Each structure stands twice: as structure tokens, then as C-alpha cells.
Amino acid sequence: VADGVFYAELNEFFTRELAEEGYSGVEVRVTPTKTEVIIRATRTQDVLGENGRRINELTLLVQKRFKYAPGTIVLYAERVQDRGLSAVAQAESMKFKLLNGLAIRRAAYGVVRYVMESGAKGCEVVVSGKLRAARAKAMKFADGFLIHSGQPVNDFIDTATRHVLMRQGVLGIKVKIMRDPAKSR
């Protein structure tokens, strides 16, 4: 397993070089004399491009830059969504924050803050259920700009529901995120 120094230096190279190709994160695993650095990705059609693009470009750029001959290291790619644009990963994170003793308000602020720092047009988190009280309550946390009717609902907003089991009862997390329509592509 390679070190976090190499991983952070590839983060430094990618954050300055993949500025408009959607660098979400880096997954990386090391087999004997092969370090596989999967570029985790906002949108991957910037990565793949027209008939095989940024993977060949960055491979040859590392081979030309970091003095690597073809055969020592290998560069991979996988297609996922942006962790902020996706309601699934943010709902996993909201479930995580609620299960580790963080309240509705600060977790909602942190998740909505991370989504708006990601680059979504807007988002909304709906939190229902019972928190230390007998009576049930619901709470909306919306920010940015969202739409609620029509075919753009099917086009632009992602919705994810999670039943998060606490010691008192069960809570229903409903994460709804509006992606940037200019970046639809």
C-alpha cells in the first residue's frame, strides 16, 4: 500500500490540472509493483471524452512529467456521481451524522453546506420523526433554488430516502438535491 504523501501529491496535481473535468476524489489500491490510482468522479464524460480522453491525456502527462516509463504504474477510472450532487451519498452522510450524536440542525447545516460547496443549484433535507420527545416532528432545510413539477423533476433533481434507526424510534431522511442545469451535458 502506497503512502498518503503520494496520494496527496496526486490530489495537488489533479486539483490544479482537473479543474474543469470533475475531480471528486481518489480511490487507490496497490498490488505488487502496481499502484492503481482510480480517479473518483463530478461528471465523467469530461474524463472519458470523445473516443478515448483525459485518462490517456493524464497518463501520458504523468509519463512525460513524472519520468515514468509505460509499464511501472497504471492509471484507471471509474464512473460514479459527484458526492455532493448525489442525494444517495449525502443521505448516507446524513444518516451517519444522525447516528453519531449530531443533532438535526448542525448536521443539516453541514450537509447542505457541503452540497452548496460542491456546486449544486440547490438542495433540501426533510427530517421527520421523534427526537427525545413523545410527539413527532418534521423539519425542512432548503437552500439554493429547486423545482417541484414536470419533466425537469425527472431530469434534474435526485431524491433519496433513508430510514435511520435510533434508540427511541425511527427517523425518515429525505434528501433532495438540484443539480446545475447548465452542467447537464
Partner: protein, 139 residues
């Protein structure tokens, strides 16, 4: 890769006009191709000087060496449009025997599509040589 383009021009004349088809393939694929891609890649306007153009011109005298050494891994390494115009004027100006031009066209038609490859195929269709029927079937 630290030569001058005059030195690369004269060394290409020397190492194509004396070395054989596989040997100048290795020369152009190792020494001319990497210096070529580093002159154009590391520059901010991504163009080429005139004497590397003359070097690629003089490298076509043995056409096996030219096509097997210069053109075929370059398009698989990422070919842009200044390389297309320059090496297409190379491919146009020097009289090439028809068999290796046919093998070059049979190579370039199979590639992933790019307007540089379109320029090279356009130059090879400016020849109108006596093509074998396999090169016609690749069209």
C-alpha cells in the same frame, strides 16, 4: 531531446538516409517522436519550428521507416492539428511509393476518429495512387 532543430534535421537526414527501414523506424519512434511531442507539448501555443518540419520531410525517403516509425504510434499518443498540418505537408511534398502509402491509409482509416487523422487521410487521398483492393475496402 536537448538538441537544436537544425541538429535534429541533420541527424534525421543522417539516420534515415543511412539506417534501414526498421532502424530508422526505431530512430524516428524514439528520438524524433519524443523530441517532436516535447517541442509541441511543452510549448504554450502548441506549434512547431520549421526545421523539425524539414526533419519529418527528410524522414520519408524510406517510407517503411517513416510510416512504421513516425505516424503510427503518434496518433495513438494524441495527435493535434499543428502536427496534422505540418506532417500532412510532409506527407504531401515527398513522393512516396504506393505500397506504404496504402498501408498508411489502411492504418489511418482504422483509427479512433480525429480531424488530424482526417487531414492525413485527406493528404493520402490527394495522391490517387494505384491502391491495392484491401486499401480500397478500408475506405
Amino acid at each position: 531531446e536537448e538538441w537544436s532543430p537544425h541538429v535534429v534535421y541533420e541527424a534525421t537526414k543522417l539516420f534515415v538516409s543511412n539506417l534501414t527501414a526498421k532502424e530508422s523506424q526505431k530512430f524516428i519512434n524514439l528520438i524524433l517522436l519524443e523530441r517532436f511531442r516535447d517541442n509541441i507539448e511543452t510549448s504554450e501555443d502548441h506549434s512547431l519550428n520549421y526545421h523539425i518540419y524539414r526533419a519529418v520531410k527528410k524522414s520519408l525517403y524510406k517510407p517503411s521507416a517513416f510510416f512504421k516509425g513516425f505516424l503510427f504510434p503518434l496518433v495513438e499518443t494524441g495527435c493535434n492539428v499543428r502536427e496534422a498540418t505540418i506532417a500532412g505537408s510532409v506527407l504531401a511534398k515527398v513522393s512516396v511509393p504506393a505500397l506504404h502509402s496504402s498501408a498508411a491509409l489502411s492504418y489511418l482509416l482504422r483509427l479512433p476518429f480525429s480531424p488530424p487523422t482526417t487531414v492525413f487521410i485527406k493528404i493520402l487521398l490527394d495522391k490517387k495512387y494505384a491502391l491495392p483492393y484491401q486499401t480500397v475496402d478500408d475506405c
